[PDB]
């Protein structure tokens, strides 16, 4: 029998089978419900739509995200995501498969229990396990020591990790990620005469962001170059399907990561949060951290970001520090891959919380076995 | 936690050198006469055990990554290193060693110098548009008649997304359900129901002893209507699910508070479908449901003949 791996994020569910090198299903982590603008007889007996199907009707529905900033905050809608993942996307009966779930850094303790409780009481899985996302990414990159920058759709974390384990006092959380970047690109595209202000428009600007944005190595310089040359400008065909052009917005958008003030956040940029996180760690491990900066998540996919990070962190760090940024091409799915490897190991059979152990202990078993 | 493995048992039991190779997600011993001949397509785990005065052993764990080894092999090497360290009470010092950049200590383990050879064992790695559903064909009149007749064949009543149900018809549904012995699920999503419907449903929940599931999502029920519903919960020990999300108006902070207070006065409800705005009640609600759900687990353990 085969184990499942589900990596649940603010924007995307990544799910599949342990032993696979990549997730089999990736879809939006959303639940859509009708707007009160008359009875949608078209819905039939359904009370909501989930995932891709809810996305198709984003103009007809109000969409809710059961995970906010990496944390599950709507347990009923999260049950819907999980049911849809098992039964419609993977086509499995969850009570036949051990299931590995992921959690955010600094996940509150009650949440871990609740996740355990729902898997056993609602889905009757035979066994389960919860692993920290950033740690799985570090493992997928072949390392037990390093500092992960995990940036997705809802949240960015710096997670320093030593000899297998996160150092929670040094973890930092920045509520600034890909959805904010999508929203910001919508804005500055509107500055130059294009109308994009939600729904079929938010989703298309996301595509623009993914395909054309990049992180400038020197930002003030790139602005000047942009004015003159035009060698940077690129165009993009809408679905409707008119064709638009875009220039300095290509790198202004993800500049926000290094300059959160671009959207009115007081926070320091991710290069600074990486630094502060390293500096909260034991002196004797900082060299290892600096030399193993591992990028994770979809918002670390911008071309140029690793070099920019290398440059910014060099300027912050002692002059004599070896610094290295690791940016795997599959880092959109690093968390999931790490989970697939872990659940495949011959030593992992004894790590599952089994139905029987949960039945006897209750959900607080998760603090003792998933650690 | 700490894990067993036949190779863990053998590890670090005495001074010397032990080498394992990652082979399809397992940790397999390297034949001692192949020590120092590393397949560049593979990943390995090396433990140096040095002996010191205490009688206690000193431990250094190196995981060696060949240039052509697959992601499952380097990830597993890393994880097995953490597991082995843990098994050894955390006393090992871990080292990442990559082909061409190995540390002097690790290179020093191999008397004749280590060698590389090509190859190794194989990796262990193995639309939609607008609602396309036929409408809810449920017959409102007929169904109401069946609930009144206490029809044994009727367990599930779904009036979701049905146009133009009079408010007195919905109120009648709630009145008939008072004495019905067979309906376990009732939902009226997106039927334009308002507070009168919710008030009647509240009275019903005080009397009905069979309904398990109630779904009133996506209607026009106010905080007062929602409050009245949950105020029925302590007079109910049969309903397990109440779904109320996506009413046309936010319920209001005061109401959210009165609601969680009622959720804490029922031990039966297992799911409450509502996204709380204030974090105080949001967590109180989550905990109340988790409390009630654990009661299920405990009576499932006690009914287990012991
Ligand atoms: N090629 C790309 N360039 C830039 N951004 C991208 C690219 N591909 C995906 N993204 C962005 O990454 C985000 C999705 O990544 P991911 O799956 O890591 O997030 P998540 O796990 O759902 O969210 P979180 O980790 O914040 O809870 C989206 O905002 C998406 O637009
Ligand atoms: Ca994520
Ligand atoms: Ca190999
Ligand atoms: Ca150690």
Cis before A241 (ω within 30):
yes
Beta strands in A152-304 (DSSP E): 156-162, 165-166, 172-174, 234-237, 243-246, 293-296
- Cβ pair B1, A351 in contact under 8 A: yes
- Cβ pair B131, A57 in contact under 8 A: yes
> Which of A190, A177, A179, A189 has the alpha carbon at shortest distance from A260?
A177
Which residues, numbered 30 to 49 in chain B, qualify as contacts with chain A under a Cβ-Cβ cut-off of 8 Å?
Answer: 43
Site to probe by mutation for ligand 1, drawn from A299, A304, A308, A337 as the one with most ligand atoms within 8 Å of Cβ, is A299
Distance of CA A48 to the CA centre of its chain: 24
Give the angle B284-B285-B290 at the CA atoms, nearest 5°: 100
> Which of A23, A31, A26 has the alpha carbon at shortest distance from A55?
A31
Tokens of B302: 């006690």
CA A219 to chain B, closest CA, distance in angstroms equals 35
Q: Give the closest ligand to the alpha carbon of residue A333.
A: 1
Using the atom order of ligand 1, give the atom closest to the CA of residue A13. 22
Q: All domains of chain A, ordered by start, with CATH?
A: 1-30+67-130+333-369 (3.30.420.40), 31-64 (2.30.36.70), 132-177+267-328 (3.30.420.40), 178-263 (3.90.640.10)
In the reported structure, the alpha carbon of residue B75 is separated from the centroid of ligand 4 by a whole-number distance in angstroms of: 18
Sign of CA dihedral A368, B3, B9, B12: negative
Domain boundaries, chain B: 1-119, 136-306
Alpha-carbon span B183 to A146, nearest angstrom: 57
Alpha-carbon span A328 to A298, nearest angstrom: 11
The β-bridge relationship of strands A234-237 and A243-246 is antiparallel
Tokens of A43: 């819905």
- Cβ pair B241, B229 in contact under 8 A: no
Q: Give the closest ligand to the alpha carbon of residue B76.
A: 3
Which residues face A353 on adjacent strands? A128
- For residue A331, which residues of chain B lie inside 8 Å, CB to CB? none
Residue with CA at minimum distance from ligand 1 atom 8: A298
Give the angle A322-A323-A329 at the CA atoms, nearest 5°: 140
Helices A334-344 and B71-87, interaxial angle, to 10°? 60
Residue B100's alpha-carbon distances to A164, A292, A323, B81, in angstroms, are 24, 17, 19, 20
- CATH class, domain B136-306, is alpha beta
Cβ–Cβ contact A19 with B under 8 A: yes
Tokens of B44: 């390995």
Alpha-carbon span B151 to B19, nearest angstrom: 72
Residue A193 burial (CB < 10 Å; 0-12/13-18/19+)? Answer: exposed
Using the atom order of ligand 1, give the atom closest to the CA of residue A177. 26
Tokens of A352: 């599952």
Q: Identify the architecture of domain B1-119 in CATH.
A: 3-Layer(aba) Sandwich (3.40)
User: How long, in residues, is chain B?
Assistant: 306
Residue B212's alpha-carbon distances to A196, A256, B14, B261, in angstroms, are 45, 49, 63, 21
In the reported structure, the alpha carbon of residue B23 is separated from the centroid of ligand 3 by a whole-number distance in angstroms of: 7
Q: A28 CB less than 6 Å from ligand 1?
A: no
Q: A70 CB less than 6 Å from ligand 1?
A: yes
> Which of A50, A52, A8 has the alpha carbon at shortest distance from A33?
A50
Alpha-carbon span A23 to A332, nearest angstrom: 11
Give the torsion through C-alpha atoms of A52, A54, A56, A61, to 10 deg.
Answer: -160
Resolution given for this structure, in angstroms: 2.3
Helices (H), A248-344: 249-258, 270-279, 283-290, 305-316, 334-344
Alpha-carbon span B221 to A336, nearest angstrom: 41
């Amino acid at each position: 029998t085969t184990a499942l791996v589900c990596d649940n994020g603010s924007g995307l569910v990544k799910a599949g089978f342990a032993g696979d090198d990549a997730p089999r299903a990736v879809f939006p982590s959303i639940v859509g419900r009708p707007r009160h603008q008359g009875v949608m007889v078209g819905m039939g007996q359904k009370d909501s739509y989930v995932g891709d199907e809810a996305q198709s009707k984003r103009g007809i529905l109000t969409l809710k995200y059961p995970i906010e900033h990496g944390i599950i905050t709507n347990w009923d809608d999260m049950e819907k995501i999980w049911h849809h993942t098992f039964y419609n996307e993977l086509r499995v009966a969850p009570e036949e498969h051990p299931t590995l779930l992921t959690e955010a850094p600094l996940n509150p303790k009650a949440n871990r229990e609740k996740m355990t409780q729902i898997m056993f009481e609602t889905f009757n899985v035979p066994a389960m396990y919860v692993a920290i996302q950033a740690v799985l990414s570090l493992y997928a990159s072949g390392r037990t020591t390093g500092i992960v920058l995990d940036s997705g759709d809802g949240v960015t974390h710096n997670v320093p990790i030593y000899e297998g384990y996160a150092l929670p006092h040094a973890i930092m959380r920045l509520d600034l990620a890909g959805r904010d970047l999508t929203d910001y690109l919508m804005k500055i595209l509107t500055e130059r005469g294009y109308s994009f202000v939600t729904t079929a428009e938010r989703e298309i600007v996301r595509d623009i962001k993914e395909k054309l944005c990049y992180v400038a190595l020197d930002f003030e310089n790139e602005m000047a170059t942009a004015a003159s040359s035009s060698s940077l400008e690129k165009s993009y065909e809408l679905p409707d399907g008119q064709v638009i052009t875009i220039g300095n917005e290509r790198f202004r958008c993800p500049e926000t990561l290094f300059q959160p003030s671009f959207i009115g956040m007081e926070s320091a940029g991710i290069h600074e949060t990486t630094y502060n996180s390293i500096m909260k760690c034991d002196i004797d491990i900082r060299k290892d951290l600096y030399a193993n900066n591992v990028m994770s998540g979809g918002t670390t996919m911008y071309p140029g970001i690793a070099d920019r990070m290398q440059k910014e962190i060099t300027a912050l760090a002692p002059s004599t520090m070896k610094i290295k940024i690791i940016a795997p091409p599959e880092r959109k799915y690093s968390v999931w891959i790490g989970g697939s490897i872990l659940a495949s190991l011959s030593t992992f059979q004894q790590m599952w919380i089994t139905k029987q152990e949960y039945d006897e202990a209750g959900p607080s078993i998760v603090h003792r076995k998933c650690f | 936690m700490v894990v067993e493995h036949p190779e863990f048992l053998k590890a670090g039991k005495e001074p010397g050198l032990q080498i394992w190779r990652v082979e399809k997600f397992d940790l397999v011993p390297v034949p001692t006469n192949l020590y120092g001949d590393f397949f560049t397509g593979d990943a390995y785990v090396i433990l140096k055990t040095v002996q010191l005065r205490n009688g206690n052993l000193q431990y250094d764990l190196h995981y060696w990554l060949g240039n052509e080894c697959s992601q499952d092999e380097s990830g597993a090497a890393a994880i097995f290193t953490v597991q082995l360290d843990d098994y050894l009470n955390g006393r090992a010092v871990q080292h990442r060693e990559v082909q061409g950049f190995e540390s002097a200590t690790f290179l020093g383990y191999f008397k004749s110098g280590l060698k590389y050879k090509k190859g190794g064992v194989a990796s262990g790695f193995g639309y939609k548009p607008v609602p396309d559903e036929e409408p809810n064909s449920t017959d409102v009149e007929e169904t109401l008649e069946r609930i009144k007749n206490n029809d044994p064949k009727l367990e599930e009543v779904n009036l979701n997304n049905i146009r133009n149900i009079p408010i007195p018809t919905l109120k009648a549904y709630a009145e008939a359900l008072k004495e019905n012995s067979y309906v376990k699920k009732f939902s009226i999503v997106g039927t334009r129901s308002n507070d009168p419907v919710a008030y009647a449903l509240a009275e019903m929940l005080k009397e009905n002893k069979v309904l398990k599931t109630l779904n009133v999502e996506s209607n026009f029920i106010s905080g007062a209507g929602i409050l009245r519903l949950v105020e029925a919960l302590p007079y109910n020990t049969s309903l397990v699910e109440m779904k109320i999300d996506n009413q046309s108006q936010p319920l209001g902070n005061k109401v959210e508070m009165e609601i969680v207070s009622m959720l804490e006065k029922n031990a039966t409800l297992l799911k409450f479908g509502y996204h709380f705005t204030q974090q105080g009640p949001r967590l109180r609600a989550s905990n109340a449901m988790m409390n009630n759900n654990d009661l299920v687990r405990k009576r499932r353990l006690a009914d287990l003949t012991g």
